[PDB]
Design a protein around this ligand. Structure first.
Ligand SMILES: [Mg+2]
Ligand SMILES: [Zn+2]
Lengths: 353, 41, 312
């Protein structure tokens, strides 16, 4: 982005990530790094130690803290002190955190200069319009019974994998794919993410993924017409730009965090065709009824409501029964899945061997 | 050609000596033969 | 053939006809009429033997008016043989012609200068030439005759005194006879000639015979880093006429495309209406025309082999 929008010559740019660690030797240059590679204290490798000294030795003139809602954490804030700079800027769409550390930003980087409305930019064509929805997938009788007895930590996996959610996700994916839409399916739970992906034969990304493979998946999802949908995870929650993505679904969630909902919605707020007549992006939220998920769902969209977004309750998807094949339509498969998820908890002697 | 170029005659040839004769562990693999390499745009 | 190619060809023809014998004209004209021409084909075209084609090819090769190319050939039903091809490398021939023209004129000019100098001397017995300066240190004690050193005999004045005019006459003749070469070289310098190669020459080939044994093809070996000395040189348009019936058909297609585009953007059903009460989701004129035509007709009367291939 830096190269494309301004005349920054490539020679003066050095990217300090886990892959490459070379630093610009020209008098004045640019360093784009990450907190994990700059906030570490105990164990730095030899290759990454020279670079850190290079960063610390020079007196920088400007620091850009992208996603500044994470700088007041226990250790990330240390970088703001170690790195010498005369100007500090913070860029974040959401300025909220569960703890009380948000106010700490005042003495770390300074006050809040400017804020912008969401609906104002939406009606001016700068960001896309989204019809937020919340689908109520009533838990099937068989699964629900176990939800009563099981403890809190396993109950989560139980109400994330109810078959009705599989059917709703499968119906929506097929319906929107026919509409020529690029869909993203978020899930903070990795086991469900893999199960959904392998069941629907679609690529997925999660934390264990090497940087290149997820990059290859991202590029394919952007330009390959056959791969219309992917399956992201908590890694893609923020700061990943997909101008082609238009629809968005989520099957799991990180409890009551209001920010993750907004950051996830951001993936589709920049859809390319956000100015053609009548276009409306989509953000679905599949939640199991009569479960603790509704408690978190009504709580994790309290920030979008303040901005102006309104969630619409969808009890039933019209035309969902006539779809040819639905996952776990027979009780046999439902029973099999229930147990499957329930069970989740002398150099010469060298020749001898 | 060099000898012709010393007498002031344009040589229609050149000395042939000047003819310069010119990662690891993957995550998802159920997409075995689907991912086309769109590396550049 | 480019216009300059004709100029080069004419220059070669003039040089061969004027500065080489008769059979030389035949050999070079054969491979100027044709492009690269195999030795066997060259023999068959002129009906001369190997012992007679040898001297001709050798001399035309020493002067670089003809280039040679040897390559291994593998006939499908015979022992592999090495074939020899002959062609013309125009940059090479022109340089040889230019150098030789310059040298011949220079030699005659120098001979004119030398012949205009004092005569000299020679000894009749030992046939040793003495210059004017060298003879002046051998004259006898009487200062009457120049004596030789080896023979101790009087010296005799040398010749070349009268040739002062003949050598100038020779130069006057040569520049008149060699005029076309100078005129052709001037035009060649203005243009830029491309260096020729066996493969390049094959593009202008006129086959000599119906069933020549030599395969006039250049299939270079694969990944061969070997370099030999002096073997390198520097859509469809479719139109469619649209009739009136086709125009309305095209309009219908355009309307259908617009309808499909509108659908792609329209909102789904569940987002349209509030779905609370609905159940939860889960598993005859023709005769008239004729009588008119007859009526008007009455009026007007009243008034008056298996291989790999692709598709291109
Ligand atoms: Mg950003
Ligand atoms: Zn003598």
């Amino acid at each position: 982005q830096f190269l494309q929008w301004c005349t920054l010559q490539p020679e003066n740019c050095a990217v300090f990530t886990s892959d490459n660690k070379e630093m610009f030797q020209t008098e004045s240059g640019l360093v784009v790094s990450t907190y994990s590679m700059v906030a570490n204290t105990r164990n730095r490798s030899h290759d990454s130690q020279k670079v850190m000294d290079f960063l610390t030795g020079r007196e920088w003139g400007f620091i850009i803290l992208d996603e500044v809602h994470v700088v007041p954490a226990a250790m990330f804030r240390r970088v703001v002190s170690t790195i010498a700079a005369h100007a500090k800027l913070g860029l974040t769409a959401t300025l909220v955190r569960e703890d009380d550390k948000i106010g700490d930003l005042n003495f770390l980087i300074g006050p809040k200069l400017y804020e912008a409305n969401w609906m104002e930019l939406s009606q001016k064509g700068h960001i896309a319009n989204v019809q937020c929805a919340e689908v109520w997938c009533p838990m099937t009788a068989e699964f629900y019974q176990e939800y009563l007895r099981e403890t809190a930590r396993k109950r989560m996996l139980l109400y994330i994998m109810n078959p009705t959610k599989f059917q709703a996700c499968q119906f929506l994916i097929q319906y929107h794919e026919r509409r020529g839409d690029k869909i993203i399916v978020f899930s903070d739970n990795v086991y469900a993410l893999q199960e959904y992906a392998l069941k629907m034969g679609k690529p997925f990304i999660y934390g264990s993924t090497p940087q290149q493979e997820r990059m290859n998946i991202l590029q394919n999802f952007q330009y390959n017409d056959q791969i219309n949908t992917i399956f992201l995870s908590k890694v893609g929650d923020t700061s990943i730009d997909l101008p082609e993505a238009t629809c968005l679904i989520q099957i799991s969630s990180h409890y009551g965090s209001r920010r993750q909902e907004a950051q996830r919605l951001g993936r589709i707020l920049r859809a390319k065709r956000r100015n053609d007549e009548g276009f409306n992006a989509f953000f679905y939220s599949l939640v199991s009824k009569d479960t603790q998920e509704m408690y978190y769902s009504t709580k994790r969209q309290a920030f979008l409501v303040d901005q102006g977004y309104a969630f619409k309750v969808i009890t039933h998807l019209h035309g969902m029964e006539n779809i040819p094949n639905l996952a776990y339509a027979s009780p046999r498969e439902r029973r099999e899945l229930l147990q499957e998820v329930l069970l989740k908890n002398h150099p010469l002697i060298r020749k001898m061997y | 050609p060099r000898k012709l170029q010393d007498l002031g005659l344009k040589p229609a040839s050149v000395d042939p000596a000047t003819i310069k004769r010119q990662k690891g562990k993957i995550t998802n693999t159920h997409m075995t033969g689907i991912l086309k390499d769109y590396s550049h745009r | 053939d480019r216009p300059i190619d004709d100029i080069v060809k004419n220059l070669l023809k003039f040089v061969v006809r004027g500065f080489y014998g008769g059979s030389f004209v035949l050999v070079l004209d054969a491979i100027l009429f044709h492009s690269v021409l195999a030795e066997d084909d060259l023999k068959q075209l002129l009906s001369i033997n190997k012992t007679e084609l040898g001297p001709l090819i050798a001399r035309l090769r020493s002067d670089r008016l003809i280039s040679i190319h040897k390559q291994r050939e593998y006939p499908p039903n015979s022992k592999s043989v090495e074939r020899v091809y002959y062609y013309v490398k125009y940059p090479h021939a022109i340089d040889a012609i230019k150098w030789k023209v310059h040298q011949v004129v220079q030699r005659l000019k120098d001979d004119l200068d030398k012949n205009s100098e004092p005569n000299g001397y020679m000894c009749p017995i030992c046939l040793t030439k003495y210059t004017q300066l060298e003879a002046v240190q051998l004259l006898n004690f009487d200062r009457t005759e120049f004596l030789c050193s080896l023979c101790d005999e009087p010296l005799v004045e040398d010749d070349s005194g009268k040739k002062n005019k003949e050598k100038q006459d020779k130069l006057n003749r040569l520049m008149d006879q060699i005029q076309p070469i100078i005129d052709s070289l001037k035009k060649i310098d203005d243009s830029r000639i491309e260096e020729n190669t066996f493969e390049i020459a094959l593009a202008r080939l006129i086959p000599p015979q119906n069933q020549s044994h030599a395969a006039y093809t250049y299939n270079p070996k694969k990944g061969s880093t070997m370099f030999r000395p002096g073997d390198s040189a520097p859509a469809t348009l479719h139109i469619n006429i649209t009739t009136a019936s086709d125009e309305v058909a095209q309009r219908e297609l355009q309307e259908r495309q617009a309808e499909e585009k509108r659908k792609q953007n329209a909102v789904p059903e569940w987002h349209k209406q509030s779905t609370i009460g609905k159940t939860a989701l889960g598993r005859e004129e023709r005769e008239n025309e004729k009588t008119l035509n007859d009526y008007y007709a009455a009026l007007a009367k009243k008034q008056a082999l298996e291989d790999e291939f692709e598709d291109v």
